[PDB]
Amino acid sequence: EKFLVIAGPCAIESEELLLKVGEEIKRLSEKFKEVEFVFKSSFDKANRSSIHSFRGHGLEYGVKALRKVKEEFGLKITTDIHESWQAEPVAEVADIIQIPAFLCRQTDLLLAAAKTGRAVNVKKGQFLAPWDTKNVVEKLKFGGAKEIYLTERGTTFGYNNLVVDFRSLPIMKQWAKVIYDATHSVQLPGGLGDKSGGMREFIFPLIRAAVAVGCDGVFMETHPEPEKALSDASTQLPLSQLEGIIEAILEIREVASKYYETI
Amino acid sequence: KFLVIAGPCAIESEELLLKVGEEIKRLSEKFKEVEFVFKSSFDKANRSSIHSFRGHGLEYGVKALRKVKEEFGLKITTDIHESWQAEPVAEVADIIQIPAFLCRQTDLLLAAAKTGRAVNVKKGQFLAPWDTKNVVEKLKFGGAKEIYLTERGTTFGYNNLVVDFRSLPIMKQWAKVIYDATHSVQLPGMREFIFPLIRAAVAVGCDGVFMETHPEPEKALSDASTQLPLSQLEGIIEAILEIREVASKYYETI
Amino acid sequence: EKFLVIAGPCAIESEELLLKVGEEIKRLSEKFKEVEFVFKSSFDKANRSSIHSFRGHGLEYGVKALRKVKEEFGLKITTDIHESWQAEPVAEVADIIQIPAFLCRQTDLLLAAAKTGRAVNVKKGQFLAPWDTKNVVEKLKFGGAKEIYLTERGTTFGYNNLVVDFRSLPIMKQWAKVIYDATHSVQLPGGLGDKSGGMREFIFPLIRAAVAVGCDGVFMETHPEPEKALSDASTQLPLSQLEGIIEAILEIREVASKYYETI
Amino acid sequence: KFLVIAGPCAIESEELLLKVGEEIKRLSEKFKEVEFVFKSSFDKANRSSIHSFRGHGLEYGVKALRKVKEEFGLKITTDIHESWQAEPVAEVADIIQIPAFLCRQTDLLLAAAKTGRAVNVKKGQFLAPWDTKNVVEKLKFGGAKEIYLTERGTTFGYNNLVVDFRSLPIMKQWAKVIYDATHSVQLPGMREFIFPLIRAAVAVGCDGVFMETHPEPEKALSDASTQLPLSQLEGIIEAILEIREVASKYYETI
């Protein structure tokens, strides 16, 4: 099956930022033809730790910027929703509607996404056990979703820390396609006080682990200059490093693929 | 004064709310030093299963809670799940409750704060005690003046929650602290530990306790495994008041 | 039943330190006659994080110092053993043989302690679930132990942190008398790099919780000047604060006692 | 070269050790680029139950391991539980193993280091990756020169272990790292995850893998639920060598 790579800047800092990242993602989609790329960027960071942190320029602006990316580069689009009313307008541009981790159990949000006819990707809550995602998928199927993804993004491990239990990949595979979030899984929740931290040095090794275990795609936030990012400045991957990372996981996926267990 | 938030988990019917409300009113008259607040959700918006009981809607719920307040003169509290619900709920709710999974949703907090009502935020199972400082700041920014933080357990491995009592004194630095005695013992995805842990909460020191109670928990449509039998409420309240009376002498300052 | 208070300096820094603490503990035993005091101090810190940290002055010296305390103040004694061969010599002075947390599953150590005829107190391992202590008690009974205690001292919660799950008290009570370790439960394992950390501000509130829930005794390390201690300098209670703490828990225990559940 | 430590969990009989040893010798000849080390415990000193299988004693065990080394020319490794055992075990053991629960027992580490043999310390389930730096220092202080640290899971709630693969690169800063593929999936107080996680270990990067194997795990007297069927060992070794070959290109320096 075609491997999915969901990538883009964490937040829609500006339409300009999007086109800059989109251009590179488009270049890679032409090179890695065996990969299905989906451009990701949040029109709103509705769950920042601090009231003073950057949120975004609004739904309207965001959808417009994302539409420009799709129009200019012919790339599929994905963005996350935070309340039920956002599903409809977002569905006009998003090929995949993303459900935030903290909201993976909010029935109406899932239902709103499902009835749009678009694919739905649910970030597994940091509080959820792998087997608890079966009911999440059930809700989505009940709501009409035909293409469902479950994203591993770490689990609460003590305070301000997340651990990735790779046993989750084969477990969740029982009921949906699985995506590994390489950038949020290394973040340190509320690790900086008013903001969350992260350990960039672990992004690559853990993504290698994900493809060796086996998944249907990877999710990576990337920014031309992470240090200047307005969100997840500590975990976004420098855009120049994206190509090498993707080549690496495709290579590891290929050699490991013959050993992937049948669910 | 010490806060006691009690009531049936879900508004299964205003009939149920009236039966539970009568007992709470009674206790209310017996324990004058305690401020009682009637709680019940008009919607269980986060059930694990799509086939589980959610409720009868916001309108029916607000109406039923209206009945309780008017008929018994008891303050009211219920939780909201999306921003638009804040205003209509604030019509009857003296305290707007923010769900644990939603404790970081900025717009929900701001929406609640804007109503002018008191706001009680359930501490997310993924949150550290010190991470709640930012939660309080959001509410203050939104105009909230009466802010509560509720301890309801922290993720401890899979399908289990642990109560780290160190959280009470930490959260007390920036808000009044409430201990949720019934959800803290639930196994995500029990009853025998409700009383022991509530005794610990008052021994450590908190500003109030949250307890879901139902005439027949066995038949409850929500949290059947952890809702306290109505008939046992009086005894537990008396017990925690006695422990608090003695222990309060040692509560640390700030 | 008579409430147990196990207290003393973490390590036997010197026979002088012991007599200084013993004197105060003796004074309190005369005041709190409803309490059974047991003087505690390790002749060896055999599991320090760093090879450079203080361990002790040897078994011989330690037993001699502990014997002096028992002889001079008529106090019961408890100390921990680390290898099977230490059970016999230690049993000559120790009324209660303590089994370290990391070693709570070492069959031969438990058996060695049990056959001495002395009481045995096992620190619950940071890796053990409350219900897993049933087999620990079974081993001890199998080995001849007639008086057994299980001590709650925290559970691994993420890295370098411990949490106290008070549900452990009523669970362990099903098969043994339960003791709450007020000082090790707030320590931060390896929190200082070459040594462990601790948060003294939580010792009192958590001990209040322990007696409200209900236990058969408490364990507290105390030192005339904690800041100068050679071990657990961050968690040992200042000796001057001991009396007030004990009075407080007896008061809370009394008022809460009528509500203690029957096992 | 890449290390592969394999063998039956417990020395149920030297007969068993010989059967497993023959297969390991065979693989040894087929995978010349891999350094095989035969492992088996002469005593399960930390079983949960007093009624569970422990072993036939140190003497019988050392004799059986002697047989394996002499008959197949395979290096040997076994664990010790008390200081006095280091010397006699070092007679046959090329690598002395330190149990996870005992990774902080200074005298056991020093005793092992004094023998002059290599020392492999199982990382305690209560230990953080960076906490192992001190463990290595103790061994170096004791004269140890060949030191290994083994990842075998970390306490994650009750009766469960999680493998935090971030540990591999962290521990690599001060010692060679081994990944225990069979104990990492055990539930304290399963099998389907052994292969997936071992693939991850080599994709991330480690200096070797530890795998308990038995002709008929179902009948094993120890770790029956997690011991790998002998017949599946070859396939898994070939698989991890292939993944390592490709992934090694990306292993981070130090």
Ligand SMILES: O=C[C@H](O)[C@H](O)COP(=O)(O)O
């Ligand atoms: O991904 C979710 C959050 O927005 C995340 O923790 C980053 O936000 P913060 O830096 O405001 O905590």
Ligand SMILES: O=C[C@H](O)[C@H](O)COP(=O)(O)O
């Ligand atoms: O209680 C056990 C230890 O000795 C504890 O962690 C304190 O030792 P450290 O400061 O050497 O880690």
